[PDB]
Structure formats: structure tokens, C-alpha cells
């Protein structure tokens, strides 16, 4: 399975589970993640979603090796959702979304933070938006609004790694945690939110995300 | 009197004065505060308003005990302004507004900071938005714009206390002061602003608040 | 010459060069700077512009002494661009713009930072917006968006000096540097950006500046 899903005290944890590929999103992982979010959106026993990665990476982003195979096959193939479908699930997700960035986040592995209501980042993790060394409309409205024009310029134009202290200093993530405290801290905050009525969490989220 | 009003060097200080009720806004205090702001807006001898609380609280927010009495009385009763009228006075106030948060700020006692041009907070004060354990459209546009999506999510969804260092780290307040330095620092900054021509203070405020 | 222009590794450095007048913009310097930006915008060998000042000042802002002479001459005279033309060149500049604030920045010498994609500031530099002791629509949308309502209120209403640590704390500048490290650090970051394809730098900038 490319995506592990587990419930605990009304927090649904999605753990990206292609650790050998640094949790790069192939089509199957894009599809699984997007579907997991729609399901979470609809499930009355889920208050909060927590997203994290298995192993040393958070997500290396789009799986470019699979993408090469797909464009060179006799017949092109796609997932039901793909990148485009994940962005729409993320953009419309009506419940609190918490990211626990456990290691490298590249491309969508970094820009996904624009849809997070809270982001915790391991002190050993780093982020990169590699667009200029190689983005979506949503990311480039959301990120500048979060970190300001200057921080966003460096993040999105440089293709340089951004470390945990820089990400926090930017306001790109909310808290830095030691590697071993990341999930305990993220989960503790998720459980505070998840104890609240789901209806009122959704109403607050909607009032702050509408513009 | 529920609201003390005093002028000194063209700064009008409004001191919420129900210290036994932690300066909870009953209808009479909502009315007095809203009226005090319209008057300040119109008074040519007032450049700046400084808002603070008497005693250990800044404001415990809407007086829920009075609200219970009102909804259980034979006849319902209201103030000329109430909550709704205070928000409109705050939203339209055309002069610099400085808040000196001297202690607990709950509900509107916290979200009122979205209308502040500067906010100073005592190092022993804490803030709470209790909506989810129990908001207005304005607060949830203004606050996210001030503190960013992630800080706003925690503030508005958690119903947890936010201490002085957290409020500053968020950008929810501008400066932290020791308890004894709060009013002297707030007043010193208010007097710098108040020495300027009122016309030009209003023009600058209007140019930065229009969108 | 009032403006020195030099190319090095696809970074074009504009060095304001009226050091005796603390790099105040007379009409000739407004015209030279605006023109230098249009040219840079069009030049395919320029990826990034770096703007800094010669001598102890970054820019003292509009040259008020020249302005007095102009309004008291028999015949009024103007530059092809002036203040108005510089703002339009700045607002439309489609490539990364980096400011290296080497000393005092007053009026437009401070508000020009609202158009910077990155701003580095010497630890001995200070900024001032003197409007109230004496602004444009763009500055007062851009600056509040960058530093938040409270920081913007102090910056734009107080007419007080803002030092390097305050400017950084506000988010008005991205990094503080020792005086001797300012240009080396600004240039190092400019060269990271400038190594990228110009087309993709412009596309990223446009996606983050459109709203």
C-alpha cells in the first residue's frame, strides 16, 4: 500500500508510504491521497487530518521517474485524480489539516504547506521549490499570503534548500520539533482540535479560508 | 461608571471599568464603549484612542451572566449599540487605536485586537478565542491577514490560552511589556502619534485600511 | 553621473550616486533610475537588478531643495519620468529586484522596499516614512501586506526612525548584514537567482505579484 491510513481519537493520519522513493507521488499515491481526503471530508468520525511521511522523506514531490515511463509508453496512462485532483481535494478540504514534515519536502512536498492549517517541521527536514532549476496558481497566491513577498521570492525563485529554522523564520511552518517530538507534538495539537465539535471546526475554517 | 474616560496630550484613554466582572461587556459597557468611540472620532481635541482594562483583566468578553438574565426575563432588553454596534464603531474608527492588553482577553476581548493599529500586551496577560469550546466575519478576515493562516487556525480553532510570547510570535500584538511598563510604553507611543496633525493620521489610516 | 550602472554575472547593479546629497532623488536621478529599470526589463543579458546607494545614505528620498528651486523659478521644469515615472517602472518591473539598504532610507528611500523581491539592510542603516511630520496608494497597499497592520501603522504614522533590528522584526527587510557584508550577501543571493533562466524568473514573479 502506498498510503497508510489510521484513526485515533478522531484524528485521521495519512502516512505517505513509498519510503524507498522518498514518498514521491506517483499516480497511485496522488489518487490514494486525494481519495483519502474526500473520504475524510465526508466521514463523521474524523475531525482532523494529519499528513506525514514514512522514512527519511516527507515527499520528494511528483515521481519524475514514473512520469518518464508514462510519456514514453506506447499508451499514455493516468490516475483518476493525479496532481490536479490532489490540489482540488486539498483546496476544498473543509476540516483542519495538519502537516508533520518529517524530512525533505520538494515541489508539491513543499507547496502542500499552503493548504495546511498547521505545519510542524522536524529540525532535520529541509524544503525546496525546484521550479526555476526545472508553479500552480494556488500555491503562488497562498504562499506569498503566508510568508510575505520577500520570503516567497526566495522560496519560489531560488530553487535552494530551506532549512527548519528558515522555514519557521519565514512563517512557512508553525513550529519546529526535534525528530522524535514531531509526531507527538503534531498529534497533541491535532487531538486538541479534534475534541471540538466537527461542525464548529468546519465553520471556523470556512470563515478564514473564503477569501 | 462602567467606562472611565480621560484625556492627556490629545490621547483619549478608555479604561473598561467592571474589574469585578473582569471587564466583561454587558450591554451598558458595549453602549458606553461604542459611544465613546463615535465621540472620539468626532472630537477635534482627540488624536488617538488608547483602550485598556481596570484590574486583573483586559476583557472577559460578552457578559454571559447578564445575557442569561436577559433571555430569561419576561421582557427582552437591549442596549442602543450592543456587540453589533461596538464592532461597527471599531470597524469605522478613523483615528489610531491602541490597545494595552493588561490581562486576560477572551472572545471579543481577544478579537478586538484585529481593529487595533497597535497592541501592547503585558507579559502576564493571556488571550483566548473560545468559539469552538462554545465568530464574526470581520475578526476572521482581519486576524488571518494579521497573523497568517496557521497562527489564526490555532488561535481561532483551539480554544486554548495564548500567552504573551505566543501572541507576539504570532504577530497578534506588536510589543510585550512588563506589567508596570505596559501603560507607560503604550502611552509613550500614543503621544508620538498624537503630536501629529489629526488630518494626516486619518489620511494614513484610511489609505492602509480601505482594502 | 547621478546613477552608476554595472553588470556582473547577469545582475545589473544600480548604485544611486549623489552621495553628498545622501542620494536624494532629484528629477535627473528619478529619470535615470526609471530609465535604467525599463532598459533592465528589456535587456536579455540582465536576470536581476540590485539597487543600492553610494556613501553613507541609501536614499534621503525626494530632493526637497531642488523641489523648492523648481517651484520658485520663473518657469517650472520637470523630468521625463520623475517620482510618478519611477513608481510605474518599479510597479511593473518584471524581473527580481533586490535592494541593499546601506544607510538611511527616508520617504521613497523607505517605501521603495515595497517593490523589492528581497531586501538586505546594513545593521547601521535606519528607515523613516516622514509623511505625518510633513503617501502613495501603492506603498500603503504593499507595505501593510508585507509587515501587517500594526507594524505598518508604526512605520507610516509615527515619522520615527526604524532601525535594522526593527525593520527585520517587522518583516520589512529579509536579512540584516554587517556593513561590510551587505553587498557580498546581497550579490551572492542575486547571483543564485540570476543563474536561473530569465523566462522562468519572470513567470514566478508574475504569478506572485498579479494580486
Beta strands in C48-177 (DSSP E): 48-53, 57-59, 97-101, 104-106, 118-122, 126-128, 162-163, 175-177
What residues contact B72, with CB distance under 8 A and at least 6 apart?
Answer: none
Nearest alpha-carbon partner for C121 in C191, C40, C51, C35: C51
- Rounded CA separation A111/C70 (Å): 52
B6-15 burial: b if 16+ Cβ within 10 Å, else e: eeeebbbbbb
Calpha distance C1→B201 (Å, rounded): 38
Contacts of C118 in chain A (CB under 8 A): 150, 153-154
CB contact under 8 A, B204 and C131: yes
Question: Could A174 and B151 be called an inter-chain contact, meaning their C-beta atoms sit closer than 8 Å?
Answer: yes
| Residue in A117, A196, A211 closest to B153 by CB | A117
- The structure was resolved to a resolution in Å of 2.2
Query: Which residues of chain C make contact with B204, given a CB cutoff of 8 A?
Result: 131-132, 135, 140, 156-157
CA C171, distance to chain mean position in Å, is: 16
Report in angstroms the alpha-carbon separations of C112 from A53, B66, B143, C17, C206. Answer: 42, 52, 27, 17, 18
Within 8 A of B116 by CB-CB distance, chain C residues are 149-150
Cα distance between the two ends of chain C:
37
Closest-approach residue (CA) in chain A for B148: A146
Contact (CB, 8 A) for C14 and C33: yes
Is B157–A211 a contact, with Cβ atoms under 8 angstroms apart? no
SS3 at position C109: helix
Which chains does chain B touch, 3 or more C-beta pairs < 8 A? A, C
Nearest to A96 among B137, B151, B157 (CB): B157
C206 to chain A: which residues are within 8 Å by CB?
Answer: none
Length of chain B: 211
Method used to solve the structure = X-ray
Q: Are B94 and B41 in contact (CB under 8 A)?
A: yes
Q: Would you say C45 and C7 are in contact if contact means Cβ atoms under 8 Å apart?
A: yes
**Å from B75 to nearest chain C CA?**
43
**What cell was used for A120?**
510542524
Inspect the interface and report whether the beta carbons of B146 and C151 lie closer than 8 Å: no
Which CATH class name applies to C1-211? alpha beta
Q: DSSP letter at A133?
A: G
**C171 contacts on A by Cβ (under 8 Å):** 148, 150-151
Cell 541609501: give the residue: C58
Searching chain C, which residue's CA lies closest to the CA of residue B206? C140
Q: A165: how many CB neighbours lie within 10 A of its CB?
A: 11
Of all residues in chain C, the one with the smallest CA distance to A160 is C192
Dihedral class, residue C55 (left if φ above 0, else alpha if ψ from -120 to 50, else beta)? left
Per-residue CA distances from C182 to A159, C19, C27, C84, C175 (Å): 22, 18, 28, 29, 9
Nearest chain A residue to B143, by CA: A208
Cα separation of C127 and C167, whole Å?
8
Helices (H) and strands (E) in chain C, counts: 8, 10
Instruction: Write out the three cell numbers for B3.
Output: 467606562
Select the residue from B204, B205, B206 to test the C interface by mutation, using most C Cβ atoms within 10 A. Answer: B204
Contact across the interface for C146 and A148, Cβ inside 8 Å: yes
Identify any residues that bridge with B139 across adjacent strands, giving them in sequence order: none
CB contact under 8 A, B144 and A208: yes
What is the rounded radius of gyration, in angstroms, for the C-alpha atoms of chain B? 16
Q: Which three cell numbers stand for residue A13?
A: 493520519
Cα(C93)–Cα(C87) distance, integer angstroms: 10
Beta pairing partners, B15: B4, B52
Contact yes or no for B172/A207 (Cβ under 8 A):
no
Inter-chain residue contact C153 with B200, CB threshold 8 Å: no
Task: Please give the grid coordinates belonging to residue A189.
Answer: 495539537
**With an 8 Å Cβ cutoff, are B140 and A208 in contact?**
yes
Pick among A111, A114, A132 to test the C interface (most C CBs inside 10 A): A132
Cβ–Cβ below 8 Å for C157 and B116: no
Secondary structure of chain C in HEC code, one letter for each residue: CCEEEEEECCEEEEEECCHHHCCCECHHHHHHHHHHHHHHHHCCCCCEEEEEECCCEEECCECHHHHHHHHHCCCCCCCCCHHHHHHHHHHHCCCCEEEEECCEEECHHHHHHHHCCEEEEECCCEEECCHHHCCCCCHHHHHHHHHHHHHHHHHHHCCCCEEHHHHHHHCCCCEEECHHHHHHHHHHHHHHHHCCCHHHHHHHHHHHHCC
Q: Where are the domains of chain A?
A: 1-211
Distance CA C47, CA C201 (A): 8
The number of C-beta contacts closer than 8 angstroms across A and B is: 62
Distance from the Cα of A134 to chain C's closest Cα (Å) equals 9
Question: CB pairs under 8 A, 24+ apart, for C77-81?
Answer: C77/C27, C78/C27, C79/C27, C79/C28, C79/C30, C79/C31, C80/C31, C80/C35, C81/C30, C81/C31, C81/C34, C81/C35
Nearest-Cα residue of chain C relative to residue B190? C158
Q: How many CB atoms lie within 10 A of CB A108?
A: 23
Instruction: Give alpha helix (H) positions in chain B.
Output: 27-42, 64-72, 82-92, 108-111, 139-157, 164-170, 182-194, 198-209
Residues of B with CB under 8 A from a CB of C: 96, 116-119, 142, 145-147, 171, 173-174, 189, 192-193, 196-197, 200-201, 204-205, 207-209, 211
Tell me phi and psi for residue C205, to 5 degrees: -60, -50
Q: Cα separation of B33 and B39, whole Å?
A: 10
Dihedral of CA C65/C70/C72/C74: which sign?
positive
Q: What is the DSSP pairing of strand C97-101 with strand C118-122?
A: parallel
Q: Which of C23, C43, C47, C20 is nearest to C33 (CA)?
A: C23
CA atoms within 13 A on the CB side of C144: 24
Residues in a beta bridge with A48? A11
**Cβ atoms within 10 Å of C26's Cβ, excluding its own:** 21
Which of C122, C98, C171, C151 is CA-nearest to residue C140? C151
Please give the Cα distance from B186 to C81 (Å, whole number).
Answer: 42
- Report chain A residues whose CB lies below 8 A from the CB of B114: none
What are the beta bridge partners of residue A120? A100, A175
Residue of B131, B151, B160 with shortest CB distance to A204: B131
Q: Which residue in the set A156, A158, A159 is minimally distant from C208, CB to CB?
A: A156
Grid coordinates representing A174?
508553525
Compute the distance between CA of residue C175 and CA of residue C122 in angstroms, rounded to an integer. 9
CA dist., res. B165 & res. A159, Å (int): 33
Neighbours of A135 (CB within 10 A): 20
Q: Which grid coordinates belong to A138?
A: 494556488
Please tell me what DSSP assigns to residue B101.
E
Amino acid at each position: 500500500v502506498t498510503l497508510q491510513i489510521d484513526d485515533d481519537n478522531r484524528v485521521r493520519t495519512l502516512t505517505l508510504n513509498r519510503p524507498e522513493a522518498l514518498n514521491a507521488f506517483n499516480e497511485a499515491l496522488y489518487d490514494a491521497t486525494a481519495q483519502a481526503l474526500l473520504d475524510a471530508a465526508d466521514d463523521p468520525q474524523v475531525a482532523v487530518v494529519l499528513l506525514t511521511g514514512s522514512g527519511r522523506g516527507f515527499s520528494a514531490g511528483t515521481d519524475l521517474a514514473e512520469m518518464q515511463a508514462r510519456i514514453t509508453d506506447p499508451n499514455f496512462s493516468e490516475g483518476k485524480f493525479g496532481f490536479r485532483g490532489l490540489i482540488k481535494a486539498l483546496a476544498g478540504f473543509p476540516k483542519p489539516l495538519i502537516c508533520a514534515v518529517n524530512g525533505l519536502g520538494v515541489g508539491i512536498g513543499a507547496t502542500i504547506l499552503g493548504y495546511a492549517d498547521l505545519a510542524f517541521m522536524s529540525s532535520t527536514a529541509r524544503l525546496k521549490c525546484p521550479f526555476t532549476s526545472l508553479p500552480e496558481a494556488a500555491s503562488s497566491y497562498l504562499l506569498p499570503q503566508l510568508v510575505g513577498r520577500q520570503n516567497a521570492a526566495w522560496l519560489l525563485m531560488s530553487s535552494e534548500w530551506i532549512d527548519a529554522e528558515e522555514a519557521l523564520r519565514m512563517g512557512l511552518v508553525w513550529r519546529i520539533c526535534s525528530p522524535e517530538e514531531l509526531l507527538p507534538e503534531a498529534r497533541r495539537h491535532a487531538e486538541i482540535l479534534a475534541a471540538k465539535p466537527i461542525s464548529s471546526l468546519m465553520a471556523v475554517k470556512h470563515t478564514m479560508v473564503e477569501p
